[PDB]
Amino acid sequence: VNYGNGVSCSKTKCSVNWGQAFQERYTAGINSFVSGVASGAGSIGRRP
Known part of the structure; x- marks a missing residue:
């Protein structure tokens, strides 16, 4: 059974x-x- 998307694996x-x-x-x-930049000053630079 378990017919859904586990019996037919994508690609060969x-x-x-x-x-x-x-x-x-x-x-x-x-x-x-982040970590590194967080040590020096990561409390003002969260704007991608």
């Missing part, structure tokens, strides 16, 4: 999507920027 692979990478890569550098 299924192992690791780029999504995971981009987030581990980008957030990794984007996250650090």
